[PDB]
Design an enzyme around this catalytic site. Structure first.
Site, PDB file in Angstrom:
ATOM      1  N   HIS A  12       0.759  -1.237   0.000  1.00 58.98           N
ATOM      2  CA  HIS A  12       0.000   0.000   0.000  1.00 58.98           C
ATOM      3  C   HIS A  12       0.781   1.273   0.000  1.00 58.98           C
ATOM      4  CE1 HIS A  12      -3.590  -2.455   0.473  1.00 58.98           C
ATOM      5  NE2 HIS A  12      -3.019  -3.036   1.581  1.00 58.98           N
ATOM      6  N   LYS A  41      -4.823 -10.141  -7.636  1.00 56.12           N
ATOM      7  CA  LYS A  41      -5.583  -9.562  -6.479  1.00 56.12           C
ATOM      8  C   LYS A  41      -6.595  -8.587  -7.093  1.00 56.12           C
ATOM      9  CE  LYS A  41      -5.114  -6.521  -2.452  1.00 56.12           C
ATOM     10  NZ  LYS A  41      -4.379  -5.738  -1.514  1.00 56.12           N
ATOM     11  N   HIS A 119      -3.126  -3.312   7.821  1.00 53.94           N
ATOM     12  CA  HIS A 119      -4.212  -3.676   6.878  1.00 53.94           C
ATOM     13  C   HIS A 119      -4.903  -2.418   6.387  1.00 53.94           C
ATOM     14  CE1 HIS A 119      -8.378  -5.017   5.732  1.00 53.94           C
ATOM     15  NE2 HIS A 119      -8.837  -4.182   6.748  1.00 53.94           N
ATOM     16  N   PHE A 120      -5.197  -2.357   5.103  1.00 51.22           N
ATOM     17  CA  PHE A 120      -5.934  -1.217   4.497  1.00 51.22           C
ATOM     18  C   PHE A 120      -7.416  -1.611   4.452  1.00 51.22           C
ATOM     19  CE2 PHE A 120      -5.722   2.766   2.274  1.00 51.22           C
ATOM     20  CZ  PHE A 120      -6.952   2.815   1.673  1.00 51.22           C
ATOM     21  N   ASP A 121      -8.266  -0.909   5.155  1.00 50.37           N
ATOM     22  CA  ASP A 121      -9.684  -1.262   5.224  1.00 50.37           C
ATOM     23  C   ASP A 121     -10.522  -0.582   4.179  1.00 50.37           C
ATOM     24  OD1 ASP A 121     -11.218  -3.107   6.901  1.00 50.37           O
ATOM     25  OD2 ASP A 121     -12.493  -1.408   7.342  1.00 50.37           O
TER      26      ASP A 121
HETATM   27  N1  LIG Z   1     -10.530   0.104  -1.094  1.00 49.97           N
HETATM   28  C1  LIG Z   1      -9.834  -1.003  -0.828  1.00 49.97           C
HETATM   29  C2  LIG Z   1     -10.511  -2.202  -0.400  1.00 49.97           C
HETATM   30  C3  LIG Z   1      -9.751  -3.275  -0.151  1.00 49.97           C
HETATM   31  N2  LIG Z   1      -8.377  -3.213  -0.308  1.00 49.97           N
HETATM   32  C4  LIG Z   1      -7.463  -4.353  -0.044  1.00 49.97           C
HETATM   33  C5  LIG Z   1      -6.975  -4.344   1.393  1.00 49.97           C
HETATM   34  C6  LIG Z   1      -6.950  -5.787   1.824  1.00 49.97           C
HETATM   35  O1  LIG Z   1      -5.629  -6.330   1.884  1.00 49.97           O
HETATM   36  P1  LIG Z   1      -4.610  -6.143   3.068  1.00 49.97           P
HETATM   37  O2  LIG Z   1      -4.369  -4.711   3.315  1.00 49.97           O
HETATM   38  O3  LIG Z   1      -3.501  -7.103   2.920  1.00 49.97           O
HETATM   39  O4  LIG Z   1      -5.454  -6.699   4.351  1.00 49.97           O
HETATM   40  C7  LIG Z   1      -5.614  -8.094   4.545  1.00 49.97           C
HETATM   41  C8  LIG Z   1      -4.837  -8.591   5.735  1.00 49.97           C
HETATM   42  O5  LIG Z   1      -5.165  -7.820   6.917  1.00 49.97           O
HETATM   43  C9  LIG Z   1      -5.564  -8.690   7.963  1.00 49.97           C
HETATM   44  N3  LIG Z   1      -6.612  -7.996   8.732  1.00 49.97           N
HETATM   45  C10 LIG Z   1      -7.927  -7.772   8.444  1.00 49.97           C
HETATM   46  N4  LIG Z   1      -8.540  -7.093   9.399  1.00 49.97           N
HETATM   47  C11 LIG Z   1      -7.550  -6.871  10.361  1.00 49.97           C
HETATM   48  C12 LIG Z   1      -7.616  -6.202  11.618  1.00 49.97           C
HETATM   49  N5  LIG Z   1      -8.705  -5.637  12.106  1.00 49.97           N
HETATM   50  N6  LIG Z   1      -6.449  -6.152  12.344  1.00 49.97           N
HETATM   51  C13 LIG Z   1      -5.384  -6.734  11.817  1.00 49.97           C
HETATM   52  N7  LIG Z   1      -5.219  -7.382  10.664  1.00 49.97           N
HETATM   53  C14 LIG Z   1      -6.346  -7.430   9.951  1.00 49.97           C
HETATM   54  C15 LIG Z   1      -6.067  -9.945   7.262  1.00 49.97           C
HETATM   55  C16 LIG Z   1      -5.077 -10.047   6.108  1.00 49.97           C
HETATM   56  O6  LIG Z   1      -3.846 -10.661   6.504  1.00 49.97           O
HETATM   57  C17 LIG Z   1      -7.851  -6.498   0.848  1.00 49.97           C
HETATM   58  C18 LIG Z   1      -9.100  -7.120   1.405  1.00 49.97           C
HETATM   59  O7  LIG Z   1      -9.550  -6.405   2.540  1.00 49.97           O
HETATM   60  O8  LIG Z   1      -8.163  -5.572  -0.205  1.00 49.97           O
HETATM   61  C19 LIG Z   1      -7.751  -2.059  -0.717  1.00 49.97           C
HETATM   62  O9  LIG Z   1      -6.533  -2.101  -0.812  1.00 49.97           O
HETATM   63  N8  LIG Z   1      -8.527  -0.995  -0.962  1.00 49.97           N
END
Ligand SMILES: Nc1ccn([C@H]2C[C@H](OP(=O)(O)OC[C@H]3O[C@@H](n4cnc5c(N)ncnc54)C[C@@H]3O)[C@@H](CO)O2)c(=O)n1
EC number: 4.6.1.18
Length: 124
Positions: A12, A41, A119-121
């Site tokens: 990210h 992805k 993590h990017f939500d």
């Molecule tokens: N607009 C968007 C929408 C989606 N996305 C991406 C982000 C995610 O990947 P990532 O950041 O690796 O996160 C996934 C990883 O994070 C972990 N994870 C999920 N929730 C968590 C939390 N609350 N605390 C810690 N880790 C968490 C699970 C996994 O290993 C993926 C699906 O959510 O899509 C994006 O980039 N932009």
């Protein structure tokens, strides 16, 4: 193996550019950062800010993550982001994405010590 904090920077962060400069940004970045190694992805966001400004979001507005966890935080300010979404012509290993440049607040999940994004939500 790669830590969650390092994986967040690799997938990210793009402090090297202020914004996507062409429609090929996503295709090139998704491949270079190895996000299309095993499969395409479908969605990925890149943030064009300093790493320190993004790590600081872990001390900003607390909010529940989309999945319900409470370790999510929303940036007070908008940030330069590039949204990458797989197109209809995407076919592994030739993953293809549509590049969308925007200025939005970001929501990330944070963990550990130091407390950093892992993590990017979402972008809102
Ligand atoms: N607009 C968007 C929408 C989606 N996305 C991406 C982000 C995610 O990947 P990532 O950041 O690796 O996160 C996934 C990883 O994070 C972990 N994870 C999920 N929730 C968590 C939390 N609350 N605390 C810690 N880790 C968490 C699970 C996994 O290993 C993926 C699906 O959510 O899509 C994006 O980039 N932009």
């Amino acid at each position: 193996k790669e830590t969650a904090a390092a994986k967040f920077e690799r997938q990210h962060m793009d402090s090297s550019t202020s914004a996507a400069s062409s429609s090929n940004y996503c295709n090139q970045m998704m491949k270079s950062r190895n996000l299309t190694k095993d499969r395409c992805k479908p969605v990925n966001t890149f943030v064009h800010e300093s790493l320190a400004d993004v790590q600081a979001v872990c001390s900003q507005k607390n909010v529940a993550c989309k999945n319900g966890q409470t370790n999510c935080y929303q940036s007070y300010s908008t940030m330069s982001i590039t949204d990458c979404r797989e197109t209809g012509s995407s076919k592994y290993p030739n993953c293809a994405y549509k590049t969308t440049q925007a200025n939005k607040h970001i929501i990330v999940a944070c963990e550990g010590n130091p407390y950093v994004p892992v993590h990017f939500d979402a972008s809102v």
